[PDB]
Amino acid sequence: QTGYLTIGGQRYQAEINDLENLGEMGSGTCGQVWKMRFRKTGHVIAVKQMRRSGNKEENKRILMDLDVVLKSHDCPYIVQCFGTFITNTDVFIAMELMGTCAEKLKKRMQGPIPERILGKMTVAIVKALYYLKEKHGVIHRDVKPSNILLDERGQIKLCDFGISGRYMAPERIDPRADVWSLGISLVELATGQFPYKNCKTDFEVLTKVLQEEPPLLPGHMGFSGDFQSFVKDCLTKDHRKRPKYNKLLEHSFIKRYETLEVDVASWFKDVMAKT
Numbered sequence: 001q002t003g004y005l006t007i008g009g010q011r012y013q014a015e016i017n018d019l020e021n022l023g024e025m026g027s028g029t030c031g032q033v034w035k036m037r038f039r040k041t042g043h044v045i046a047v048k049q050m051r052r053s054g055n056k057e058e059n060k061r062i063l064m065d066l067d068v069v070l071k072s073h074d075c076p077y078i079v080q081c082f083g084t085f086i087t088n089t090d091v092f093i094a095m096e097l098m099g100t101c102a103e104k105l106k107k108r109m110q111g112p113i114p115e116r117i118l119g120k121m122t123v124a125i126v127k128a129l130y131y132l133k134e135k136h137g138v139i140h141r142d143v144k145p146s147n148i149l150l151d152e153r154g155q156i157k158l159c160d161f162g163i164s165g166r167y168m169a170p171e172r173i174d175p176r177a178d179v180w181s182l183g184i185s186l187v188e189l190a191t192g193q194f195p196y197k198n199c200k201t202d203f204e205v206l207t208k209v210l211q212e213e214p215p216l217l218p219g220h221m222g223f224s225g226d227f228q229s230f231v232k233d234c235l236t237k238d239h240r241k242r243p244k245y246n247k248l249l250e251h252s253f254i255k256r257y258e259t260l261e262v263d264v265a266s267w268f269k270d271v272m273a274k275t
């Protein structure tokens, strides 16, 4: 429903001019996203703006993503929408403000991200894809580090569903393909290096994926055996032998970080402090 903004129980009748524009965030990968402040509360939020005069293709993608996120109001690992504003000229989609994405944390850190953090990250992302395949029959089709968002309070959510209904897997080029993309992302963040960084064209990446063996987590960085095993599983070329989430969620690596307390909130704020 339009016109209402609800930040945690408290619902507020509001309109666009009840918000102060604090500047844009990054690029318009799905839409133009502003950081905005609620003049009544003081709360600052992310607001995506869709202009009705905008690109027809981008607008179809923004509506799909919204469709998925309103459906996912009860997944703690998918960013929550706080409400919508519909004016004669624009649609304003209020999202909870996250910090940044794993891609930019990799930039800031200038090196590997510790297994402790990638652990909590694997739990939140696998359960997100599982919740999305089970309760709604959607699959993501674009899981990559720029789509994994974090915040200062430790939360790790998944964010961009604009091309999602029902980093590319071998059988998505040559017929659980979101399982492959998660593994490529995990190897990138774990080593700080993208495993197909020397390819000068898109098709050259696709030939590497099908011709050479999967990128494996190296053995000399102290990675635990469970983490190495989990990545080897996701990075199975033959999709017939790749596990579904019900089997993935029973992996020991998943089980270690469901229970273990990992202070990602502190690790996040220190990385962001370093320039």
Ligand SMILES: *CCC(=O)N1CCC[C@@H](n2ncc3c(N)ncnc32)C1
Binding pocket: 025, 026, 027, 028, 029, 033, 046, 079, 095, 096, 097, 098, 099, 100, 101, 102, 103, 104, 145, 146, 147, 149, 159
């Ligand atoms: C890699 C992260 C990044 O640069 N982007 C693209 C720009 C928009 C940004 N972003 N999208 C939704 C967001 C929410 N809800 N909070 C914070 N940043 C957000 C992701």
